[PDB]
């Protein structure tokens, strides 16, 4: 298929692109480079074994989106482009609503204009909001996310859902997940966050590598086996794969297809730290801090539906998540070149 | 104050503008004319006793919005611009999300750029979603609206709320209400809907005037006194007034001010039909039909908060709503001139 991948140079997008190319699809990457560097492009092509077309631009530019779709005769679109920092979203709500909500809107308006009707949305498990019932199932109603970021994700899901109802020939997947971690097994692609990492893994990684002094652990008095918070982590390669399978199997199958992508289990903070100490060969430094306000003691997604309907399930482990991360750091200590 | 009124040439906006001008504010009307005609302008000026500046344009054009705010040194903005047809929204979701959600976003992004921080949002009681607890109070959590229109309204409320939190010096009112009806007592301004009226009143009005054969009443077996659905109707002059008071008293008072605007009581379908037969001098034709799917038997807003905090309450009656409507039809049978 001919696939446009917005946000194709980012973390999840880059790995997905490689898999797409490996499966022989024709890939067009659209990225504005606000959170990625052109230097990943050549890596993508090399690992994918095929050349992807790159277009630097913004999803908010409806005109350019239309042009692209037309020019490349796109069949389907995998949408990763947007902003995703939860704390920053509380500080700069408008940027989040413009990139995420308006950004998706402009993008699907261009699709309509170009006659494209296959869409894969990189969603978020934040949509379940504060559900005390765990694990989360696709059959659970959505809740109210707490940050502008979470809210933007739910808004886009609703917008897409109404669009499908009005244009019943569309096929739209809403892929929900929690924490993507890990890196391509080559160690030549991985997460390259700029500034302070918000996500546990990257943070742990930076402490281990010596960029940070110690990890602060938010609470040690939860009703969990070891007293630390239990979360959901998915290897970026498993996640990329899930996006590819969904794109392939859902194309031209009208409807709104909702799927949780995850391992189907939770891991504690300590579990993740220990996996990492293990991968990097030295004890990661940490200390305890108080609970982070609004935190549940445990949370994870039920991924049965995806197993059943798409025949998809994870195949990477927590240790591999830690190892592959350390492997990329080790090989590209300064990230992607400028 | 210097006030920009988006959607100033529309139904609610036109009446509001007249009141603003009467109170001596300097008014700038911004309207794209998609659902109104330039011919109301001169009426507005005449009834207001002062000249309002008119600018034809779209809220989606951030550049023009910025220019305007600057040029006219705006102090506060009353935002009525958007699309509001519930059925059409189910058919054309994207237009609703673009005009309402993106339209408000572009508008508040321009305000930020121009340093304007007083906003009055014309919201909707649809935000309470399917609350079985009546009457609805501002203290009730919001629910999930059922149509794209309802949803767009809740989305904008949330966006504004997050914006205020991030920019704490802003003053933002969220004015919620149900069914605006009626007309300026001069009979020289009123609702001028094109095509089939969706709202009960306008419909009743068209049947009475002879444009339609009969009113269909959706169910006569509800658990209400007369078996027909009980709703909330507010005279457009009372509504306009509430918008003016809110603008005046809330200016420069930081926060998100939520207020329901209504009479504090419900009226049945038959009640409204009888009021109308009364105003037009002939029995309105009607027949019963089955219940409309998703309808509650009764619904209305509690307006105590506004009485208490703004010292505002309605002063027009149901009969007046009917009379003033008939009065405008009688004087301007073809609506506003082309
Ligand atoms: N728990 C969660 O919700 C979960 C966690 C991570 C990622 N995600 C989603 O996955 C997607 C990809 O995230 P990621 O982790 O790879 O982050 P990322 O920042 O590496 O990738 C996003 C890419 O989009 C680009 N981009 C941003 N705004 C753009 C715009 N307006 N036009 C064009 N390009 C634009 C950035 O340059 C970047 O390359 C996002 O939609 C994100 O919300 C969700
Ligand atoms: N129950 C409810 O929710 C309730 C019922 C009626 C009105 N409202 C709200 O009140 C407001 C005013 O409604 P109204 O009844 O006077 O309808 P209206 O159509 O008469 O007024 C809206 C005006 O905005 C203009 N407009 C539309 N999109 C625009 C855009 N993108 N740029 C500039 N101008 C634009 C139209 O030309 C029109 O003059 C809307 O926000 C509407 O949703 C809510
Ligand atoms: C960084 C981020 O986007 N967090 C979001 C993530 O939370 P989520 O809890 O899934 O993931 P995080 O990476 O934020 O935290 C993982 C776990 O590690 C803990 N932890 C994290 C970082 C750290 O320095 N120390 C520490 O102890 C957390 O308390 C938690 O128990 O998705 C949730 C929605 O479902 C949101 O509520 C969160 O705001
Ligand atoms: C036209 C419109 O926007 N309706 C919206 C309005 O409903 P809402 O019920 O407030 O107002 P309407 O004008 O649609 O209907 C008023 C009453 O009259 C009845 N009626 C209406 C029209 C008609 O031809 N015959 C008839 O019998 C309705 O069943 C109801 O009992 O706000 C609600 C949100 O709170 C939405 O759920 C509705 O979709
Ligand atoms: Na339809
Ligand atoms: Na670097
Ligand atoms: Na802040
Ligand atoms: Na006319």
Short mmCIF file of N, CA and C in Angstrom, two decimals, chain A residues 52 67 72 97 206 276 285 309:
data_model
loop_
_atom_site.label_atom_id
_atom_site.label_comp_id
_atom_site.label_asym_id
_atom_site.label_seq_id
_atom_site.Cartn_x
_atom_site.Cartn_y
_atom_site.Cartn_z
N UNK A 52 12.16 5.72 1.58
CA UNK A 52 10.91 6.42 1.90
C UNK A 52 10.99 7.87 1.39
N UNK A 67 -2.17 18.23 -1.47
CA UNK A 67 -1.20 18.11 -2.56
C UNK A 67 -0.48 16.74 -2.47
N UNK A 72 1.18 11.58 -4.21
CA UNK A 72 1.63 10.24 -3.97
C UNK A 72 0.56 9.20 -4.01
N UNK A 97 -3.76 21.97 21.77
CA UNK A 97 -5.03 21.88 21.04
C UNK A 97 -4.89 22.20 19.56
N UNK A 206 18.91 8.04 31.59
CA UNK A 206 19.83 9.16 31.71
C UNK A 206 20.65 9.17 33.00
N UNK A 276 16.71 -2.37 34.31
CA UNK A 276 17.70 -1.42 33.81
C UNK A 276 19.10 -1.62 34.45
N UNK A 285 20.96 4.59 40.43
CA UNK A 285 20.73 5.35 41.65
C UNK A 285 19.29 5.90 41.75
N UNK A 309 -8.67 -10.43 17.28
CA UNK A 309 -9.04 -9.87 15.99
C UNK A 309 -7.93 -9.64 15.01
#
